[PDB]
Design a protein around this ligand. Structure first.
Ligand SMILES: Nc1ncnc2c1ncn2[C@@H]1O[C@H](COP(=O)(O)OP(=O)(O)O)[C@@H](O)[C@H]1O
Ligand SMILES: Nc1ncnc2c1ncn2[C@@H]1O[C@H](COP(=O)(O)OP(=O)(O)O)[C@@H](O)[C@H]1O
Ligand SMILES: [Mg+2]
Ligand SMILES: [Mg+2]
Ligand SMILES: [Mg+2]
Ligand SMILES: [Mg+2]
Ligand SMILES: [Mg+2]
Ligand SMILES: [Mg+2]
Lengths: 306, 306
């Protein structure tokens, strides 16, 4: 018998439905590439039993905490099963937007001005210093949970008195949140596959930002790949993303989200270490422009595992 | 029936002998406190089996990667067992001196000037540019692996032409290495227990730095607790350590190592999320001076767990 591969999909995060779609596509893609792969949903199957179940290797198609944040990676390390994507530290770090931003700023990489808040800071009342820092960002701002994906818990604030509503929403999803300066765009994303940086994609939502609807349900979002940048700027963007990726310590494959601001500079938003892999997701779109079918892409991601 | 507690000790790192000593102390302290505790060494016992063995909670007294770096924490999270100390992300970051330094720099906290190198860079041979950056640090410098403890793999470089030998050593111990400005001292450490910062300790080794012998095997090291700082200065140190702790996201307990430099300012060296607990160890000294028995200290660390 050749290796048996578990495609972990679904799980229990806010991104469960996205992950069910990613894993459905990855399962078929791997089987098309001759890989003996099976779907396993950790919501229904105890993943501590994977080795007992006869699996040799794991393709992680989970998104969000519990699959993307180092916890599952640590279990798999101790179980001794090779797995796709980044290891424990870089997965945990990339899930935490607050600490990714601090790390990048420490490395001299460009990030949007921001204020971080804990639940205790917000619900016990903002200090004068915090209020001053928030005021200095101007409006609009965007508010995000630190540890979500798929634009869950995120919103744009257009009036001072409505910041509290954005903060209450974000605190429904995490214990720590970010208030960030609004960036003008345009918006890009850059996939990484092994040592290869894939062609950037320019993303144009029809509404206010690339929210859950714009990501998964709209026929109106526009995508440009190639992204239409002057060659030197595409190269700059690729080099920025490579430095962001290596600073975090990520490996295997992933996708970094980036926006221009009205000063003409790129700013890093976040890194994703288990990116969406629905048929129509962004990593497959960039890989298609670099000559890879979806099956070729997933077989390559798997080949990179330990 | 009362909880059955596993004290994890020993393991397979360079710090194994220290950990066997830490775990022996912790075990006696817990039992002295009425806790039903038992030692388990992961080198001898398959730790993925703890819950199957009837354990309810885990006291981590391991030191170094694979006990301290988030991997074990992730496994315990998926097994559903509460455990002492920091979670996955903060454990992983605290083991990674390079990324701790970047995060702290991003947060505006004081860190010694440094250069980082990867193994691939070292194997290729160093560029004129990298040598230029290293040269800017001045001399002396210390060379350390990023992810070790107990002063393993470290050397003091007092001549420019001695750097290569120091790197050849540190690369035996990690794939990422730091070259840091040599700090004048004096040297301090600060224990954290729950929400409490304990009074600091001034550490005076007899040799060139606080090396493995000075830490565990010498009767010549001196320790001062209280540290002899002016009241405002002790308060400054505690505040710095609290910020450094909260920036990494650490919880439960730990210990942060700090040095003065010749500008009279404090600089953060590193955080340790499973600190030593031996008769030579620093957390027990801070707890003793703060009016706790060692048994009360370990019962408290356990009570703080999840
Ligand atoms: N500072 C910002 N200004 C404007 N739009 C932003 C900003 N940060 C994020 N966005 C928008 O919100 C989307 C989701 O933000 P991101 O930081 O990538 O979190 P997620 O993990 O949920 O994708 C982005 O794709 C972009 O459309
Ligand atoms: N930049 C430096 N200058 C002078 N001494 C240092 C410096 N960095 C570390 N040391 C010495 O080396 C010891 C161990 O370094 P540390 O960074 O705490 O790593 P470890 O995890 O091995 O303890 C310190 O306790 C201190 O005596
Ligand atoms: Mg994301
Ligand atoms: Mg995103
Ligand atoms: Mg240490
Ligand atoms: Mg020589
Ligand atoms: Mg002794
Ligand atoms: Mg130390």
């Amino acid at each position: 018998m050749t290796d048996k591969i578990a495609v972990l999909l679904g799980g229990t995060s806010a991104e469960r439905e996205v992950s069910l779609n990613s894993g459905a596509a990855v399962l078929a893609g791997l089987r098309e590439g001759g890989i003996d792969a099976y779907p396993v949903d950790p919501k229904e199957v105890d993943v501590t039993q994977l080795k007992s179940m006869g699996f040799q290797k794991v393709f992680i198609a989970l998104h969000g905490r519990g699959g993307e944040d180092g916890t599952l990676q640590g279990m798999l390390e101790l179980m001794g099963l090779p797995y796709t994507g980044s290891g424990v530290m870089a997965s945990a770090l990339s899930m935490d937007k607050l600490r990714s931003k601090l790390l990048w700023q420490g490395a001299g990489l460009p990030v949007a001005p921001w204020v971080a808040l804990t639940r205790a800071e917000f619900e016990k009342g903002l200090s004068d210093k915090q209020l001053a820092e928030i005021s200095a960002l101007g409006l609009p701002v965007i508010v995000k949970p630190s540890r979500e994906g798929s634009s869950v818990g995120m919103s744009k604030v257009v009036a001072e008195n409505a910041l509290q509503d954005a903060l209450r929403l974000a605190f429904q999803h995490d214990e720590e949140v970010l208030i960030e300066k609004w960036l003008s765009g345009p918006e890009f994303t850059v996939a990484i596959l092994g040592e290869e940086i894939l062609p950037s994609i320019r993303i144009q939502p029809s509404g206010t930002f690339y929210d859950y609807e714009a990501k998964y349900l709209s026929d109106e979002t526009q995508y440009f790949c190639p992204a239409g940048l002057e060659a030197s700027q595409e190269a700059n963007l690729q080099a920025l993303v490579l430095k962001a990726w290596t600073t975090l310590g990520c490996k295997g494959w992933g996708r970094i989200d980036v926006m221009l601001d009205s000063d003409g500079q790129f700013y890093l938003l976040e890194a994703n270490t288990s990116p969406g892999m629905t048929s129509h997701s962004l990593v497959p779109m960039a890989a298609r422009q670099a000559g890879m079918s979806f099956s070729q892409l997933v077989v390559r991601i798997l080949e990179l595992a330990d």
